[PDB]
Write a protein that binds this DNA or RNA. Structure first.
Lengths: 275, 256, 275
DNA sequence: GCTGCGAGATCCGCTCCGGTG
DNA sequence: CACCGGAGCGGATCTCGCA
DNA sequence: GCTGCGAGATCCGCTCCGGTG
DNA sequence: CACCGGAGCGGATCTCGCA
């Protein structure tokens, strides 16, 4: 532990990873990793390997991107939760044409939110106003990050493959595109052999708001909750409603965190209802 | 299965297939079959018409029962454009039957060949059903009135048509607040469930059936055709009573 | 099973994967996969996802590639088994200069075989004769496949990083390159904290041929062997020497396969030695 | 008759030690 | 005295980008 | 105040059925 | 009668390349 200054000097001179230094001078690897963190050259030359994710979100939250196939502009519209897709060819990527396509889209379906990249048509102020005009949240992804729209990119690849497989069988490129839409919307099935269109229909049936509104008549009970650390709980903090009661646990909301949280039934006491 | 009970109730009261499946939760196709077989009373059915408005030709697609409608501007009335429109329409929906008049585009040989390729029933001739015809004229009048209503506000003619489609499919409501889109979605969901549960499994198969009296099995009767084979039970008709009964698969001899 | 012709017709028309067809028409998925195999469009558009490998080989089997750093030509020499490396800068990639570098290399170490890409210096007939002149096997990798020399590519990346980290501390670029060689040959240690140079030295000590030659005096025994299929063995095929005897199994060579093979001691009968 | 791999960074599984009821 | 993280040790696992 | 995923192809783990000692 | 692949079923796992 007394050789730590010499280890730091060697790190400054040569800049090897902490594992070798730990195995050599017998210093805990936490100290060596902190040395690497507090150094300069290794800090400047280390790489940020992170996993991140994708915005699957919920029902009716879609994103889109353009298609460059055979020097023809095509719009492909992709669902995230169920997996449905839809596409149509357009002469250009102009704002007015994009607005017309979006209006037809919103006539056909009932979306809620839309994601997109920094494309001029997507970013256009009139398009943003129209999206606001129909009460739909429009968020722009960070520029030069196709992984945000990786879903539409994957669907793009699959649709191009299906066009390659299906184009010579029909007279019209639009007809072939419709056939590929059928292939990837009704025929493309996996797992339980259920179409993305069927998933979307079932999602709409569940999302029907009449049942959700009328479920309010169910009995509501109150309770306290506490947090467990090393098996040692805290105080019974705050009265909150029993959102649902399960076997061995319930569902509660913490106003401090403003998010949903689960507590085992052992740390829960039931409040009797009015009588 | 409550389907044979529904069919007995139909043999008693002779109500329409609509109220039948609404109030007994039975297949729409089964209700149509029962209406067809019931001589007292004797899905995805569409009608297509052409109409001009500022000298523009537009396809009109109206479903005969739920009331959902669809429209799209077209350059001309000729067969190739009709084929493209019907290809897009079949891409967007999953129809089962179509009713139309004797228009050249409808009666074109290649159009009917592509109908057969898609495997859907096509019927041409003079429309004789007031139930569908009057709905067609009502849809036409309402659509033209709403488009005259909404055109000045919108920049694009196609945008105005899309807005009128929104008004006539989502905003407009009837009964307990059910849109044509809502009723179409409900019927489509139930129809697809019953199709995947009953249709593709087996067809036109005969069998032997027996009736249990206080648990005692009866003599094998028939033979009769298996019309609706479900989970652990089938629907067959007793010839004497002209009624359908629930017979468990353990009491059925499958005739090859 | 009678719907197979219709399934084949649908495959010819639309060309979806076998899983969906199997889940739809209730046909065994082997038949559908064979249909896809015997079709044409899916055969033409399927992708060959294979894993392959790398030629780690044994001791003293190396490969090399050139370095394009700061518009300066550098030769980097990489070991595969132990992990040692060595490098030196050269003005150009000419055949004579490469021959001089190889001769210095063979003076410094005692290699056995060398791998390389389609580089003109590596492919030169005089270089091949010189490699033959020193009794070293030279094989050329398939062109335009850097994954064959992925080892030297990885070492290239690491050495460039270490140059970036170490260049300003020395006057001469050659001195910095030597320092990076020290870093990656003596300091870069993992696992048991043992240097690649130490691994190479121990490999040479083990590969010393005197012990291998003098091990022949060990007793040699003969035996038969058989192959097990479903628990049913065959005939006792061929007399072969007991190369080594272990606990529950031995080592034998099959002249039919001309490779080494292991048989459990249960299927082995010991031949008594001469007495 | 031939051939993708490894530095680097957090997280976690874990085991003696700890607080902890 | 049982129990769970705490810390240390060791291993498991992710993208990336070199040619 | 934000965000890589999924068609496609072999191999394998496995469970009733089989040969098999 | 125990035992191991055989075949079928289902799941586990690999690179790649789309923008």
């Amino acid at each position: 532990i007394e050789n730590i200054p010499l280890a730091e000097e060697e790190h400054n001179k040569w800049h090897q990873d902490a594992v070798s230094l730990h195995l050599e001078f017998g210093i805990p690897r936490t100290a060596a990793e902190d040395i690497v963190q507090q150094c300069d050259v290794c800090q400047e030359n280390k790489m940020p390997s992170t996993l991140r994710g994708s915005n699957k979100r919920g029902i009716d939250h879609w994103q889109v991107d353009y298609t460059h196939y055979e020097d023809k502009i095509i719009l492909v519209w992709v669902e995230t939760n169920s997996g449905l897709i839809y596409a149509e060819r357009v002469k250009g990527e102009t704002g007015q044409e994009f607005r017309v396509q979006t209006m037809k889209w919103y006539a056909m379906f009932a979306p809620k939110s839309l994601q997109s990249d920094n494309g001029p048509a997507f970013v256009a102020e009139s398009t943003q106003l129209l999206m606001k005009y129909l009460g739909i949240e429009h968020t722009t992804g960070i520029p030069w990050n196709p992984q945000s729209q990786a879903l539409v990119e994957r669907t793009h690849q699959t649709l191009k493959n299906t066009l390659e497989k299906l184009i010579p069988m029909f007279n019209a490129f639009e007809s072939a595109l419709a056939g590929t839409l059928i292939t990837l919307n009704i025929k493309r099935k996996g797992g339980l052999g259920t179409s993305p269109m069927d998933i979307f229909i079932f999602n709409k049936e569940q999302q029907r708001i009449q049942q959700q509104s009328k479920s309010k008549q169910e009995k509501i009970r109150f309770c306290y909750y506490r947090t467990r650390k090393r098996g040692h709980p805290g105080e019974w903090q705050g009265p909150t409603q029993v959102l649902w009661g399960g076997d061995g646990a319930i569902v509660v909301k913490d106003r401090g965190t403003d998010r949903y949280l689960v507590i085992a039934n052992k740390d829960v006491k039931f409040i009797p209802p009015p009588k």
